[PDB]
Design a protein around this ligand. Structure first.
Ligand SMILES: *[C@@H]1O[C@H](CO)[C@@H](O)[C@H](O)[C@H]1NC(C)=O
Ligand SMILES: *[C@@H]1O[C@H](CO)[C@@H](O)[C@H](O)[C@H]1NC(C)=O
Lengths: 41, 351, 103
């Protein structure tokens, strides 16, 4: 939900590296983990 | 029919039996998800919170290092900002599990720091840069400061990395629980226990408590074996919590003192080089809340029977084939146990 | 409407050297930057009131500095992008989205 009621707000979307989680030195997920967009409420 | 044992007539065909089997599968998955949801959300919340808190600590430390460079060594900026940013970027990348060498972080930090110190602080006035980078390590200009920082930060960063990996693997196995596919024989036994009473024309009759017990202990024989390793996982995590906020926050004093240390022998160094060239509270509450779920795998069949409609009295109940007065009486599990053994060894070795 | 002559091209920060973004349109009376959805402060804009030789009309060129600290502290979903909005007596016009990234 847009944190700010009036004007510029925020919307977040998480993307975790857990399907599957790296083991015994496996290469971790490449790129960004969070997504944030400006919203007008 | 292949599930409903026909003792008398029957009100259901083979297709209705398949529908009952699929509804049994879905009901079992719903019950497992309801059992695992609270713990899954607990570990997800804590993983997210600890990740953000560690990132806040790293950001504050990078900010203070940049600010202390701006204030005490303006002659080293803006190059100081470059190597500080690279150092703390590699710090965060290591915390989040990327293949980063801690000794290499510290060594590249001091390799970048020494030439600007020499050119701007010691001998005021691009190609000779590599000669200075080599002389940094060949003449041991920073003394034991690089190894001190190396051990200081490797010790904390490895325990934090393994803490986050442990949280993630707990999330993984708790997500796996509610997706556990069972045997065909168990599918048919669950269909008999939950629905085959409807095929005999009964409307509100529930299965016997003892019949639910035998069925559940029948198909959860593998899942119950996870309880030992899950208990060891909880206790090893408790062993680990009992590191990294304090260390990263004292780094600035150590770096300032190392710069002083190098400037202390400038006389000989310049001539030689000219010739040659609330966190702990959170993890405590997390462990105290996680110890409430140590019985999760052992209490799971009890949960399935206590949350399914059953006749606890074992009177006027469904026994899977008839209404009685009294009741008569690997691979995915292997992967879960493999990963639990691995994470438990990794935990125990840290503390 | 305003026609852009010099549309902003995607810049790249090298060795913490802040590279400014160029914007030139005619006919234009107000030119502003919208970096990552929100307006850029008036102080950051540097306007130039030019006159074209090919045609006697009011041209406007605005430059805005983008520092490394701005990109490295931006934690949004997409690449640090900026857009140019020009005002005319008839309406407004948007330009290309130049994404400044820490190479
Ligand atoms: C960032 O730098 C400022 C200026 O010295 C300081 O007040 C603030 O505490 C720092 N923040 C972080 C995240 O380090
Ligand atoms: C932005 O600031 C930097 C200072 O390092 C400079 O190199 C660049 O040319 C500047 N652009 C401006 C002031 O609009």
């Amino acid at each position: 939900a847009c944190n700010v009621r009036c004007g510029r707000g925020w919307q977040k979307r998480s993307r975790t590296c857990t399907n599957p989680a790296p083991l015994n030195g496996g290469a971790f997920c490449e790129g960004m983990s969070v997504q944030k967009i400006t919203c007008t409420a | 029919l292949q599930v409903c044992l026909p003792k008398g007539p029957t009100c259901c065909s083979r297709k209705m039996e398949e529908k009952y089997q699929l509804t049994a599968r879905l009901n079992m998955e719903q019950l497992l998800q309801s059992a695992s949801m609270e713990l899954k959300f607990l570990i997800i919340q804590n993983a997210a919170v600890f990740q953000e808190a560690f990132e806040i600590v790293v950001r504050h430390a990078k900010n203070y290092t940049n600010a202390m460079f701006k204030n005490n060594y303006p002659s080293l900026t803006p190059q100081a900002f470059e190597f500080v940013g690279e150092f703390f970027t590699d710090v965060s990348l290591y915390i989040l599990g990327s293949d980063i060498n801690v000794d290499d972080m510290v060594n590249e930090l001091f390799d970048s720091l020494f030439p600007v110190i020499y050119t701007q602080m010691m001998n005021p006035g691009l190609d000779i840069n590599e000669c200075l980078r080599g002389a940094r390590r060949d003449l041991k200009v920073f003394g034991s400061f690089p190894k001190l920082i190396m051990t200081q930060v490797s010790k904390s960063l490895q325990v934090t990395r393994i803490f986050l990996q442990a949280l993630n693997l707990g999330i993984e196995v708790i997500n796996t629980t509610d997706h556990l596919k069972f045997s065909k024989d168990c599918g048919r036994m669950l269909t008999r226990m939950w629905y085959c009473s409807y095929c005999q024309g009964l409307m509100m009759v529930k299965p016997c408590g003892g019949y639910c017990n035998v069925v559940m202990q029948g198909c959860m024989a593998g899942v119950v074996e996870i309880d030992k390793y899950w208990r060891e996982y909880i206790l090893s995590l408790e062993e680990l919590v009992n590191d990294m906020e304090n260390v990263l926050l004292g780094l600035f004093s150590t770096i300032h003192d190392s710069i002083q240390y190098v400037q202390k022998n400038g006389g000989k160094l310049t001539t030689t080089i000219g010739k040659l060239c609330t966190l702990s509270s959170r993890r405590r509450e997390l462990i105290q809340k996680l110890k409430s779920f140590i019985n999760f795998y052992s209490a799971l069949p009890g949960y399935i029977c206590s949350h399914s409609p059953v006749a606890e009295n074992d009177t006027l109940c469904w026994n899977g084939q008839e209404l009685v007065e009294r009741y008569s009486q690997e691979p995915v599990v292997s992967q879960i146990i493999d990963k639990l053994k691995h994470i438990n060894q990794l935990l125990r070795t840290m503390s | 409407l305003p026609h852009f002559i010099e549309e902003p091209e995607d810049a790249y920060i090298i060795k913490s050297n802040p590279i400014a973004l160029r914007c030139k349109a005619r006919p234009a009376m107000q030119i502003f930057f919208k970096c990552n959805g929100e307006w850029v402060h008036q102080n950051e804009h540097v306007s130039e009131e030019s006159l074209d030789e090919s045609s006697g009309l009011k041209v406007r060129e605005v430059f805005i500095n983008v520092t490394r600290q701005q990109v490295e502290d931006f934690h949004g979903p997409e690449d640090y992008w900026c857009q140019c909005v020009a005002w005319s007596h008839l309406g407004t016009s948007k330009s290309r989205k130049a994404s400044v990234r820490i190479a």
